[PDB]
Amino acid sequence: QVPVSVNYHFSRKCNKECLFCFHTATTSHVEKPENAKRGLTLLKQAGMKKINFAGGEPFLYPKFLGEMIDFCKETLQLESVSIVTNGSLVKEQFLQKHGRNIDILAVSCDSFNEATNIKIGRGSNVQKLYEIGSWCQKYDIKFKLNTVVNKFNHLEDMNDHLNALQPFRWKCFQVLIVTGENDSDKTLRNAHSLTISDDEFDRFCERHSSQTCLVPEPNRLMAKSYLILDEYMRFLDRNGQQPSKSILEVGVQQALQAVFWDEEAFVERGGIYDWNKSS
Template structure:
């Protein structure tokens, strides 16, 4: 039996394939090998048996993975809260119908109020914000909880995203300082980095936004993120970014030794990694102000 861990959530980057080329992306070299559906379902069962309660399917662009609906269905059948993080470009009613009933959260990546800025950073070709607004409407329509993920860069730290966030009306908004990882985005992200002070300015401008009673934006510095996420690559290895470089480990070894031996559980808790994702409201386990 795996040792008990306070880490109850995992990000599985199920594919390296992506239709965007975001310069700041920290998951650019995940490896092209994807496990079979059968092996993937075994991985999900191992995670469930280890006490993982929430899984986020990411990429790359996870909607490009043809078996994503099957993975979501399996994870849901194991009792997990299921989330998908997407750029939203392929999110139409047909796609949402294929996920409906097995997905609790959909996270949209939106980093600027301006389509031109998003395009400059490689997120889309000048239509990303418009697509995200349309996707947000469809997500709400399907009664799936909406999360917005924002990476703050040198091109966006002075922006006021309040109007856009109000229009999208997310249940959760996570705001992250750009994290530079050796071998991932260190070269492509040159010129996009920001100081801790600039990130604090962005935080002060947005921290008071009340998304719903008792729920405010969550802000994560680069230091908060480093080593505090449980991440799995497309081929089923555990990915660590400690030292701002990628190191891979056997999933079986990590689960046997305990997730907390690899993931900094104090950082995980301090950044709000554990919250009431089944019923996000006033009684949150932790609300980061």
């Protein structure tokens, strides 16, 4: 297997408290920028073309994030560099310094009601979201949305906002139940209350049939179709077995085979696309 698109969850720490979080703040480890430049360079030669900087909240570590996305673009010559943010801590001066090297910026908002955001776990607003879009236009970054369809917001009509906001990519996740993260009271979270049925999700997706960018991801396709990197730089298996050893201590090949990655769901959910800043 060739790791084309990789999600580097370099930290688990965050300033929000979404009830359904499936990458909880179980540890506060973050890698040295020396070791992270090992893994990303090791992963580039292995076949990586898109990197996604996610985790807990990546803008809690703006210096690390800034050093890596510059390294990933300028010296690694990577096809596409992405970031996924909740939007609270994003600031324009960051996009001044590094926006030349950001190819896709993904702001995730689950509702446009401040009341719904409160119930889900975002205290507050949406003016920030429109602001980041304005910044993305100025600094030539591709702007995408990530909303999670859950019990609170599965009835909403988000069309009017998405025509003006107009993202090139709009992911709608059916709430996922990662075992170990948000499947019991023992864990940091418990998302079973926010679960919605297959038809509840389809009503949401069918309601936004006017949206061309809409890319749905039910639990069929989201569960085991991602290449996830720990803060310790090890691939996470979402099939049942424990995580691999670090790519820093063993290398990419041994780490990838220690994890199940369904390349068919990867292609079905639209994992390969026009991810570059051109074309």
